[PDB]
Structures are given as C-alpha cells and as structure tokens.
Design an enzyme around this catalytic site. Structure first.
Site, PDB file in Angstrom:
ATOM      1  N   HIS A  98      19.788  13.627  12.431  1.00 33.98           N
ATOM      2  CA  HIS A  98      20.557  14.721  11.861  1.00 33.98           C
ATOM      3  C   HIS A  98      21.491  15.447  12.822  1.00 33.98           C
ATOM      4  O   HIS A  98      22.672  15.611  12.526  1.00 33.98           O
ATOM      5  CB  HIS A  98      19.578  15.692  11.203  1.00 33.98           C
ATOM      6  CG  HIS A  98      20.222  16.721  10.335  1.00 33.98           C
ATOM      7  ND1 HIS A  98      20.450  18.008  10.762  1.00 33.98           N
ATOM      8  CD2 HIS A  98      20.600  16.682   9.037  1.00 33.98           C
ATOM      9  CE1 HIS A  98      20.929  18.723   9.762  1.00 33.98           C
ATOM     10  NE2 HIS A  98      21.029  17.943   8.704  1.00 33.98           N
ATOM     11  N   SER A 110      24.552  20.116   5.073  1.00 33.14           N
ATOM     12  CA  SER A 110      24.525  19.829   6.514  1.00 33.14           C
ATOM     13  C   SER A 110      25.872  19.412   7.077  1.00 33.14           C
ATOM     14  O   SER A 110      26.194  19.747   8.218  1.00 33.14           O
ATOM     15  CB  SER A 110      23.538  18.703   6.852  1.00 33.14           C
ATOM     16  OG  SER A 110      22.212  18.971   6.440  1.00 33.14           O
ATOM     17  N   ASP A 169      19.934  21.804  16.436  1.00 32.71           N
ATOM     18  CA  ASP A 169      19.354  20.901  15.460  1.00 32.71           C
ATOM     19  C   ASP A 169      18.152  20.118  15.995  1.00 32.71           C
ATOM     20  O   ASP A 169      17.320  20.676  16.721  1.00 32.71           O
ATOM     21  CB  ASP A 169      20.460  19.944  14.993  1.00 32.71           C
ATOM     22  CG  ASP A 169      20.293  19.512  13.554  1.00 32.71           C
ATOM     23  OD1 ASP A 169      19.571  18.528  13.288  1.00 32.71           O
ATOM     24  OD2 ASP A 169      20.884  20.173  12.682  1.00 32.71           O
TER      25      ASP A 169
END
Ligand SMILES: [Ca+2]
Ligand SMILES: [Ca+2]
Ligand SMILES: [Ca+2]
Ligand code: NA
Length: 466
Positions: free
Chosen positions: A86, A260, A45
């Site tokens: 994230h 996600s 990520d």
C-alpha cells in the site's frame, strides 16, 4: 517547448493528462516549469520500497523512518499476500521517477519522497504522533491514506499526542509556515459512513480529499461530509480506468484503487504548488484549493452555490483539483492575515431533540473584538448530545448567507446509544462568507422510530480573518 514524460505507462495515466479534458491538469503545471523540485513529501503508511526502480531516484532517507520497528529503514515487510504494498503504491503516485523507461510518473516527479512505516504493527497514539511529527523542518507535506474503521458506526479521531503533533505541525513545521497534512476522506461509502465522524479528516489542520471516477461520478466507496475540501480522480466501475503506480516487489500496477489513491495525487499537486511559491502557509494552501478547484465535469445530486458564489458538494468539496490553476495562482498569492478564532456558545439551556430540533442564533462574529471575523475559513459546530440511536440523526448547519452544511447524514449501521461528546463537526462550505447574522442548527430523527435525546451543548467556532 515543454517535453512530456516518455515512461511506458504515462499514456495510461489518464488522470494526469488527457485529450478528453477530464483530468487534473498536471501537464499544464509541468509546462509552467513545476515538477516538485526541492519539495519533500512523506508517505505515512505501511512502508516504502526505497529500492523500487521508479522510486530510488527520488527516495529521501531524511523523510523516512520505521516507527513500527524503531529503525530508520522503512522497507516494507514482505509476505505472500503482499499486505504491505500500500505505501509503495501511494509513494509512486506522488513522485515516481520520470523519463526512465519504467512504469509511469509521479505528479511531482522531481520531488523527494520518503515513507514512514507505521501501519504494520500496533498503531498507537504514540506511533501516530511520531509519524506526523517526523522531521517537521525537513518534510513539507505528509500524506495519509488511512484512518479509523469505515464500518459506518464508529466516531473516532486522533488521541492527545497525535493532536499535539498536528498542532505543533501547523504552528512550527516548515519554519513556521506549517506542515501540510493531506488526508484520504475514507472508503465507507457502502456502509453509509460519514467523514465527519472521522477526527483526522474532520480536522481543520488536514486537507481532506475525496474521489471521483473516470466518468465523473461519485465512487461506491465515497463518504460524503462537509469537512471534505476537494477531489482527485481514483477508481470506479470495471469500465473505468484506475490508478497506475509503483507496486511492491519492484512491479508496476494499473489497479491502485479507492480513497487511498486520491490523497497522494493531491499531495503531489500541492508539492508542485509549494515549488511555485515556497512561502505559502498551511492556510494559504487551503485557500488556493478552494479558489482553484473545479466542479465542472463532476456529477453529484447535491451541488449547491454558497454565499460567495462557489459550487460545493458533500461528495467533492469544491471539486476537482486543477494543478495548472494551483501553480498559477500560487505565484501571485499574498499571504493571508493571521488566523482569528471566534468562540460562540449557543445554548442557554438543554434542548429536547424529539423528532426535530431547530436552534437559531444571531451572532456578531466577535464584532469589536480582536478576533472579529468578516471572512470565514473553517467553522465547527461542537455538539454534546444524548440519543438512543445515533445513526438515525441527521444534523444540518445553515450559515447566515444561506449555505446548508450537512454536518451528519443518517448512518443506518450506527446503533450507538452514546451520542456525541463535544464532537467538533466541521464544514468548509462557507469559506470566505461573512459569518455575522443568523445561524441555524437542525437536528432531525430520520427514522419513524420514537427516538429520544437531549442536546446539551452547541458551541459555534469560527476561524478566519477581517
Ligand atoms: Ca525497518
Ligand atoms: Ca518512471
Ligand atoms: Ca469513514
Ligand atoms: Na480536514
């Protein structure tokens, strides 16, 4: 005898354990003694805050790297907007530390967690390949909550190096048992996107995971397609709870959302499963998911029973993952036979599409040959066709046992005139069916417009065993 987590936010992690019986049944797996000990998971990520109080305890440098800046330290790049939070949020879902008075807990709270910083920069084919292929003999599971743009008009997938990384992974990773690649199916629901137009999710090498809201509905961001394998909970409307996890700047968040948040939960459950049986191959893992996933409690307008009696939906695959069932079945699992591949080129001449086209073909599935398949796993319909307005097309594939897989639903925003060039639409809906018999491909113009085009190639590829 098992004592559950005492973390302050554990009670808010409704998807892990709940009285409402509407959860991933993770506590049942922990109670059986599985917490991910010995398993290594890596989050590909935008980085991982390795010093986060709820991650440091499980952080694994050996499962990490910074491909964007070419160094071994995956620390996120801090900005006022917290753009790179994230990866850290996804990491906490998988392995946030348990019983440490901080935030919540990960699904596999004793697993080792790493992160590859690869989204914070130019994401090239080489960048992807180096991430997917990082330490294949140390890392067991790779989780990816990213992919091609979800504008509902693009058809994209891995370039050559990334493809090779996937292939090397399932072939040689984990001492030959094969790397486990978990993928988020996509956030293009509002754009009417199809996850079969995404080569990462559509790949047989990845376990594509979709989402369900707390009340058991198809989230607004959800993309439907036949390549999705299963589902895990995520966010929905504002009356529904969301995902609780570790956030950038050593914080805790209760608002991790979208596609996600689903893949990481799946990655965690898979980690518990590998602890239960470290000898499971990448294919065994997909079999376990198909067999143990639960449709019950999930609402969809397309639930259908396939040839072997299992319910399947294009929004959920085989349903919600069940950690307790996964670890239970894993212990007794016998490794599946070697994978066979039967290639069947269907067309003997180009076919005009017009308003509707139907192609029928009775196949023997390589009967009498070394790759004869009686028990199907994945199936691909490799199509090459021209059309004036791609998004107006809807393509369906019917198995001999009557299972209708929608390879492509209409995509209103897709005005492309480029058609499909040997695109491998994949379906998991006929898993375990006998593939011999008549298959039917249906291509229809869903609009009233006078569209035109030609189907020049239809190759049916069957994977499976005898
Ligand atoms: Ca770095
Ligand atoms: Ca904690
Ligand atoms: Ca998409
Ligand atoms: Na996949």
């Amino acid at each position: 005898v098992y004592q559950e987590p005492t973390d302050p936010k554990f009670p808010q992690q409704w998807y892990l354990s709940g009285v409402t019986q509407r959860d991933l049944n993770v506590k049942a797996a922990w109670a059986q003694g599985y917490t991910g000990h010995g398993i290594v998971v890596s989050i590909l990520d935008d980085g991982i805050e390795k010093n986060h109080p709820d991650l440091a305890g499980n952080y694994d440098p050996g499962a990490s790297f910074d491909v964007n800046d070419q160094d071994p330290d995956p620390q996120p790049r801090y900005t006022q907007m917290n753009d790179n939070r994230h990866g850290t949020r996804c990491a906490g879902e998988v392995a946030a530390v348990a019983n440490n008075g901080v935030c919540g807990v990960g699904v596999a709270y004793n697993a080792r967690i790493g992160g590859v910083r690869m989204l914070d920069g130019e994401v090239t084919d080489a960048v992807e390949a180096r991430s997917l292929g990082l330490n294949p003999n140390h890392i067991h599971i790779y989780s990816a909550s990213w992919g091609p743009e979800d504008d509902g008009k693009t058809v994209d997938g891995p370039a050559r190096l990334a493809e090779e990384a996937f292939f090397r992974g399932v072939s040689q990773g984990r001492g030959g048992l094969g790397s486990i690649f978990v993928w988020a199916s996509g956030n293009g629901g509002r754009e009417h996107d199809s996850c079969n137009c995404d080569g990462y999710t559509n790949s047989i090498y990845t376990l594509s995971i979709s989402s369900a809201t707390q009340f058991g509905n198809v989230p607004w961001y959800s993309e439907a397609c036949s390549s999705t394998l299963a589902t895990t909970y995520s966010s929905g409307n504002q009356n529904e709870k969301q995902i609780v996890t570790t956030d950038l700047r050593q914080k805790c968040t209760e608002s991790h959302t979208g596609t996600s948040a689903s893949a990481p939960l799946a990655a965690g459950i898979i980690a518990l499963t590998l602890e239960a049986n470290k000898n499971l191959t990448w294919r065994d893992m997909q079999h376990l998911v198909v067999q143990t996933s639960k449709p019950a409690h999930l609402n969809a307008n397309d639930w259908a029973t396939n040839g072997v009696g299992r319910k399947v939906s294009h929004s959920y695959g085989y349903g919600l993952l069940d950690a307790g069932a996964m670890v239970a079945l894993a212990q007794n699992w016998t490794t599946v036979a070697p994978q066979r591949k039967c290639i069947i080129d269907i067309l003997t001449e180009p076919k005009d599409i017009g308003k509707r086209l139907e192609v029928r073909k009775t196949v023997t599935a390589c009967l009498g040959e070394p790759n004869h398949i009686t028990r199907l796993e994945h199936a691909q319909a490799r199509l090459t066709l021209s059309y004036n307005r791609r998004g107006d097309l809807a393509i369906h594939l019917v198995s001999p046992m009557g299972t209708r897989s929608t390879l492509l639903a209409a995509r209103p925003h897709d005005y492309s005139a480029d058609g499909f060039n040997d695109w491998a639409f994949m379906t998991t809906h006929s898993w375990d069916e006998d593939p011999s018999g008549e298959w039917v491909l249906e291509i229809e113009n869903t609009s009233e417009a006078n569209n035109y085009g030609t189907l020049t190639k239809f190759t049916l590829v069957l994977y499976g065993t005898a």
